[PDB]
Design a protein around this ligand. Structure first.
Ligand SMILES: CO[C@H]1CCN(c2nccc(Nc3cc4c(cn3)nc([C@@H](C)O)n4[C@@H](C)C(F)(F)F)n2)C[C@H]1F
Length: 299
C-alpha cells in the first residue's frame, strides 16, 4: 500500500560533537550551537543540538523519525541522534535563526526580491512535504529557518503526520481537527502575511477562542501596506472555506516565481533595490575544515 521508508537513522557518539552556546530554550529543553567533528573525516560541521519522562522521549523520537525521513533543499533534515542520559537531535545550524525574527530585525534592508523568493522557497518545501504525503500542521514564520538571507528552510516536525496554533490553522482544523495539505496551504497564507507585515502578530489582541467565530463571519487578516492586490488575492485564496478551492503548493510556486521575476510590480517598498543583506560573497560572512551540512553526504 505505502512504500517502505528506507531512511537511515544515524546514531552519533557524544564525543564527536561539542556544544558552544545556547541558541534557544523552552519547555521542550534547550538548543545549542555546536560543531560535529565525525570519525577521522577532517571536517567540522556547524550544528544545532536539541537536548531534551518517557512520554517526552517518545515525542522527540516521533519528530526524529519524520525529520530523518525528509531530503529537500527547502526542508531541514535530521543529521543524527545521540543516545545519552538525555536524547539529543543533531540538526543543521541555520545561522540567521528563524525568519520571523529575521523580518522583524532586518526590516529596513528587506526588499521585494527577498520576500517573493522566500515565498517561492517555502512553497517548494511544502510541495516536497506534500509529495512525501506529510502534513506539517505547524507551518508559521517561526518554523521557517534562515541558512543564509537568500536560503530558507521549513522545520519543526513536532506536529507532522502522514496522509495548538489556532491563528495559523484552517477553519476545518479548529472546528473538526481535519488536517490535509490544503489546511497547510491556509497556514502558508498566514506565514506569507507574517513576512509581508515584517513579522506582525496575526489577529493581535484577539483571544484564540474568538478566532473560529471571526473566521466563520468572513473576517480575514488585513491587506499588508506593501502588498499589491495581486499578492493579497493569493493570501485570500489560501483562506477560502472550501479546502479544494485554495491554491495548491505547486501553483503557489508558479505564481510567486512569476512575481519574483518583476518584484517591484508586486510589492511596493520604500528604497527597494538599494537595500543590502549579507551574502557568501561578503567579508567575514562565514574555521579550518568547516563544511556545511548540505555538502557533507553519507558516512
Ligand atoms: C522546538 O525545537 C525546534 C528548534 C528549531 N529546529 C531546528 N531544525 C533544524 C535546524 C535548526 N537549527 C537552528 C535553530 C536555531 C538557530 C540556528 N539553527 N538559531 C536559533 C535562535 C537564535 O533563533 N534557533 C532556534 C529556532 C532554536 F534555538 F529554537 F532552535 N533548528 C526544529 C526543532 F528542533
Amino acid at each position: 500500500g505505502e512504500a517502505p521508508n528506507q531512511a537511515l537513522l544515524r546514531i552519533l557518539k557524544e564525543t564527536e560533537f561539542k556544544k558552544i552556546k545556547v541558541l534557544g530554550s523552552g519547555a521542550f529543553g534547550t538548543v545549542y550551537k555546536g560543531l560535529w567533528i565525525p570519525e577521522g573525516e577532517k571536517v567540522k560541521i556547524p550544528v544545532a543540538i536539541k537536548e531534551l519522562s518517557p512520554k517526552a522521549n517518545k515525542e522527540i523520537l516521533d519528530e526524529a523519525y519524520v525529520m530523518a525521513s525528509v531530503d529537500n533543499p527547502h526542508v531541514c533534515r535530521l543529521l543524527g541522534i545521540c543516545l545519552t542520559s538525555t536524547v539529543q537531535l543533531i540538526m543543521q545550524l541555520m545561522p540567521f535563526g528563524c525568519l520571523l525574527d529575521y523580518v522583524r530585525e532586518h526590516k529596513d534592508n528587506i526588499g521585494s526580491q527577498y520576500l517573493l523568493n522566500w515565498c517561492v522557497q517555502i512553497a517548494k518545501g511544502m510541495n516536497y512535504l506534500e509529495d512525501r504525503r506529510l502534513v506539517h500542521r505547524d507551518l508559521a514564520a517561526r518554523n521557517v529557518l534562515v541558512k543564509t538571507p537568500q536560503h530558507v528552510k521549513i522545520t519543526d516536525f513536532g506536529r507532522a503526520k502522514l496522509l495548538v496554533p489556532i491563528k495559523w490553522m484552517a477553519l476545518e482544523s479548529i472546528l473538526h481537527r481535519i488536517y490535509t495539505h490544503q489546511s497547510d496551504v491556509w497556514s502558508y497564507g498566514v506565514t506569507v502575511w507574517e513576512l509581508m507585515t515584517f513579522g506582525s502578530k496575526p489577529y493581535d489582541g484577539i483571544p484564540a477562542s474568538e478566532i473560529s467565530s471571526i473566521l466563520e463571519k468572513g473576517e480575514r487578516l488585513p491587506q499588508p501596506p506593501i502588498c499589491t492586490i495581486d499578492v493579497y488575492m493569493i493570501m485570500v485564496k489560501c483562506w477560502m472555506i472550501d479546502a479544494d478551492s485554495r491554491p495548491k503548493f505547486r501553483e503557489l510556486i508558479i505564481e510567486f516565481s512569476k512575481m519574483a521575476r518583476d518584484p517591484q510590480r508586486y510589492l511596493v517598498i520604500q528604497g527597494d533595490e538599494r537595500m543590502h543583506l549579507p551574502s557568501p560573497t561578503d567579508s567575514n560572512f562565514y574555521m579550518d575544515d568547516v563544511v556545511d551540512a548540505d555538502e557533507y553526504l553519507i558516512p
